[PDB]
């Protein structure tokens, strides 16, 4: 990465896992409504 964006290095190492969280988020919302 460019040295100007070395700030968000810990943030970059997290971003790829975010889509998987959407799969898990669907179960939270479903558990919240009690699996109607």
């Amino acid at each position: 990465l460019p040295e100007a964006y070395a700030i968000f290095d810990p943030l970059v190492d997290v971003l790829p896992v975010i889509p998987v969280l959407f799969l898990a988020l669907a179960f939270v919302w479903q558990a919240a409504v009690g699996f109607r």
Partner: peptide, 29 residues
């Protein structure tokens, strides 16, 4: 070094927080 762990903290809780907010507000869940 654990800035590591701070990112996944706010990002990871960002999901369920919306569900919690929509619950206490009794939104269209």
């Amino acid at each position: 070094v654990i800035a590591q762990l701070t990112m996944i903290a706010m990002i990871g809780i960002a999901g369920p927080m919306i569900i919690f907010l929509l619950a206490v507000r009794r939104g269209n869940l």
